[PDB]
Design an enzyme around this catalytic site. Structure first.
Site: not given
Lengths: 469, 469
Positions: A24, A82, A128, A173-174, A308, A310, A376, A432-433, A441
């Site tokens: 990213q 991080r 990630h 991650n995720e 994480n 949101y 996150e 952001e993908w 963000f």
């Protein structure tokens, strides 16, 4: 009053930080010997999958601008940062036989050194989502059990090169997001399932993610932890799941099941070394089984868990196989025309600060985790290319969002949850993908018109002033 | 058969080239001592006026990448390259009293030397819309007769520094566009007239452009031309104007009037030292008068005229004052549902190759110009962020467009027009003003995701093979 929340509401040793991931922010996608990841390939071969058709070749250029990011982190004054290591940057062919990239290792050493020199602790994620394309092509990446040993050799390299200085590691991650959007919805690299099969491949991929995690944690604990005295964990995707009708036994069960399919899918294996009951029941023979040695390796395989968070949803019972139809729920955003919360700049991100408190309480009660970090939490700005920097950086919605969530984290700690730190997502506006660059963000604004110039938003200044040591 | 057109259809000394302008390609907007132009200010203060809210801070970075552009021009193998000098790069405050910027002069020297070292002739425009903000702020830029002396001092600096090597100069590019969109529509910098007054300011601005042009030509002819032996001219915006009904006396007069208002506005003064009759009639007391000295200075004030041509329109009589309503015409695109030509990637650009033949014939017949260049002609790609570079670079619409227009230029030369060269617009995809980066005119594709990497389109390869040498 959340607008007053500060460092002095938290324990002395409580860690505050901010986050990024390699694909990213770094750019330098083909610089310094980096090999391609599946995200390189997905964005170049299928730019229709990305808003604006963009990619991470340059991103916000933290590969060349890392000194400036370190300087920003210093002025921000928070304890920790991080970031992730790009697997195909240190191993361009993913396995040791593809060569070890010294210049890639040098980059991470310079970054780690710059952080320490400035009193900033590095929290480093190994994986990630940027799977080396070489492993994807050779045997299908996380579709194959071969990914487990390759991941372990990559982990070992990173512990060897960096573990003298890095004391906080995360395997993945995720993995939820990686598995579901990669192999159920096909919206993320490698873009399967929309060949592919959303009824089988998400379960294999998650099964291999879990085995990779467990194997890398066992490697760290048996081969590195005594000499290096660090800690290793993992970060999971969460979203609070509320019963649509609080009084409906059925909606209560449906919301618990949605928590099982999203969080439990990864959390139960590292708790009892098996999947959640609800998943075994609804997924049946399509859910892989652990051997007794794998279960033993998986059970208790963390020093901490990062969460994480949101947003949140209401959940009700639902009325070819697919992951998403296996959950047997319907998501609802509204009760009687009232959304669970206002939208951010994204229509899926509904702002519900109590959600973070509930997920934290839920996680301690259900999985008994003794040490948790929020790895996150954050929110994206409303899209508006019409605004000057002066106007763009007045990010009141973010400022309120961070205050309310951090308040709620403190409330979870009063409820008995042992939370050791909180990392805002993200330090910088970044890629952001599937949404490209339009979704911002960062607590730090990026000027995409002018060499990705960094400028702190109001939220950054508040964090500094309220949370500096 | 236009697909066969090549260098062997033209005289031995016929010049082929490509073009750019400083603000559209350079970037380095605040680098190397450059001061701001009206386009910096317009794009930063009013990013809503620009599609995507972008600006020329970095553009395609030809400021740092000039060596790569020169290498591309060398591989392309055409005789010449048309570019412009940023006035506020060499004089950051516009007048000598704002300082002379040696690093800015260095840059243009390096570019000119690189071009000559590779057998490429530089064609250099002094003014391509980038008015120094210091002059805009101190006295209103082209609204004030003070712009004439300041422009002459800037011209003299350039002749002095570069004229030993630059033998083909142009004072202004498309002053028509500058005047009308800066001061009648307010769509371009400085964004006036949509304070401002579209009924008066376009005519003052054009009057001062003309006086600046004439004064700089007189300076060159009296002070530099004998020692340096170069030539100086000017480039004008054109669009072919066809009567809507070929048989209607009224429509033929309307099309001639639309030619008078667009081209005649600038061409009659440098022919007879006055404005077109139709303009004096319809503009009345709002059209400034030249003194007899100014008329003498303006008449015959060029060694050559450059024409810029894209498109064409049908014209019919028309049915607060404003430039647009003063023309007293209505533009039509269709005869009985048949457009004058197909659209490019832009809905205003209708492809009418015969228009370039007609504008050249018209210009020699009406103004008796002895030496003409086509200084711009080209077409923009359909917007589609979904294409890979392989697909994007197959610009067969451009390839056909260039062939057909070049064929038509050769037809004009058979008609008796003394055309000495032809420049495609543009060398590189670049910043296309109010449209931003989405409108790609380049024969060389630009990868905006990856440091503005240049790659030749099909059209560049055809140009090289057909026109090399």
């Amino acid at each position: 009053d959340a607008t007053r929340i500060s460092r002095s509401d938290f324990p002395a040793d409580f860690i505050m930080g901010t986050g990024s991931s390699a694909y990213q922010i770094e750019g330098g996608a083909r610089d310094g010997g980096r090999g391609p990841s599946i995200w390189d390939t997905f964005t170049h071969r299928r730019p229709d999958m990305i808003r604006g058709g963009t990619n991470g070749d340059v991103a916000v250029d933290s590969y060349h601008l890392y000194k400036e990011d370190v300087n920003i982190l210093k002025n921000l004054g928070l304890d920790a940062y991080r970031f992730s290591i790009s697997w195909s940057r240190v191993l361009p062919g993913g396995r040791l036989s593809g060569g070890v990239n010294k210049e890639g290792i040098n980059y991470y050493n310079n970054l780690i050194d710059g952080l320490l020199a400035n009193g900033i602790k590095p929290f480093v994620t190994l994986f990630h989502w940027d799977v080396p394309q070489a492993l994807e092509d050779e045997y299908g990446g996380f579709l194959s059990p071969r990914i487990v040993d390759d991941f372990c050799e990559y982990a070992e390299l990173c512990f060897w090169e960096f573990g003298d200085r890095v004391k906080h590691w995360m395997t993945l991650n995720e993995p939820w997001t990686f598995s579901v959007h990669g192999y159920a919805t096909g919206l993320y690299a490698p873009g399967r399932g929309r060949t592919g099969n959303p009824g089988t491949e998400p379960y294999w991929v998650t099964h291999h993610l879990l085995l990779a995690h467990a194997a890398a944690v066992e490697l760290y604990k048996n081969k590195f932890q005594r000499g290096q005295e660090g800690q290793i964990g993992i970060s999971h995707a969460t979203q609070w799941m509320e019963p649509w009708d609080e009084n409906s036994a059925s909606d209560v069960e449906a919301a618990a099941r949605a928590l099982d399919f999203m969080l439990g899918w990864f959390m139960e294996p590292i708790t009892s070394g098996d999947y959640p009951k609800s998943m075994k029941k609804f997924v049946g023979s399509r859910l892989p089984k652990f051997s007794p040695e794998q279960s033993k390796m998986l059970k208790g395989s963390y020093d901490f868990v990062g969460l994480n968070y949101y947003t949140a949803s209401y959940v009700t019972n639902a009325s070819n196989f697919s992951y998403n139809t296996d959950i047997h729920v319907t998501y609802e955003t509204d009760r009687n025309g009232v959304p669970i919360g206002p939208q951010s700049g994204s229509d899926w991100l509904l702002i519900y600060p109590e959600g973070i408190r509930k997920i934290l309480v839920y996680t301690k009660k259900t999985y008994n985790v003794p040490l948790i970090y929020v790895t996150e939490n954050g929110v994206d700005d409303v899209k508006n290319t019409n605004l000057t920097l002066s106007e763009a950086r007045k990010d009141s919605m973010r400022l309120k969002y961070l205050q309310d969530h951090i308040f709620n984290v403190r409330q979870a700690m009063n409820d008995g949850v042992n939370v050791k730190g909180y990392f805002a997502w993200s330090l910088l506006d970044n890629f952001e993908w599937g949404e490209g660059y339009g979704v911002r963000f960062g607590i730090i604004h990026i000027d995409y018109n002018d060499n990705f110039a960094r400028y702190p938003k109001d939220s950054a200044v508040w964090l500094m002033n309220s949370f500096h040591k």
